[PDB]
């Protein structure tokens, strides 16, 4: 794995963690998943975690984090993966991402992207140039 990527993931890990313990909990991520315009219950909150959880404890630990990350870092057989990021980017649930919802998520995570950066990035998967990224456009970008 590229050191550059490692340093980048370091940033992500720094945003999910809010206790300084070094482990991803349900209470920490739940807070972010809340700022996304949603409100999940204990059943939903663990459902999301179970997706990453493979040990059976209900917590995003390091062992699962490595495998989980490898499952996306080199994801080119996107099955449920498409939906994951699609449901995180598509807040309206219409199936079309834009500088509308993307801006919100980019700011929610705390990445170094301005409003102009959002529109620019949006044209990476935007082939027709409609200002939105559809499922087809996303598939041919993530899987291909």
């Amino acid at each position: 794995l590229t050191e550059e990527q490692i340093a980048e993931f370091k940033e992500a890990f720094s945003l999910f963690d809010k206790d300084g313990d070094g482990t991803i909990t349900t209470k920490e991520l739940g807070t972010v998943m809340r700022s996304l315009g949603q409100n999940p219950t204990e059943a939903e909150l663990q459902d999301m975690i179970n997706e990453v959880d493979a040990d059976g404890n209900g917590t995003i630990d390091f062992p699962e984090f490595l495998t989980m990350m490898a499952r996306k870092m080199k994801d080119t057989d996107s099955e449920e993966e498409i939906r994951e990021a699609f449901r995180v980017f598509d807040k309206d649930g219409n199936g079309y991402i834009s500088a509308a919802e993307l801006r919100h998520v980019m700011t929610n995570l705390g990445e170094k992207l301005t409003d102009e950066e959002v529109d620019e990035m949006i044209r990476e998967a935007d082939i027709d140039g409609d200002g939105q990224v559809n499922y087809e456009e996303f598939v041919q970008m993530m899987t291909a």
Binding site: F9, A12, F16, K72, M73, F89, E124, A125, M142
Partner: peptide, 19 residues
């Protein structure tokens, strides 16, 4: 799901860095 969508977001945001 969550932390993984971040990895997906990073991949999608890393894919822009090409052309």
């Amino acid at each position: 799901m969550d932390c993984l969508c971040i990895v997906t977001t990073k991949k999608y945001r890393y894919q822009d860095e090409d052309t």
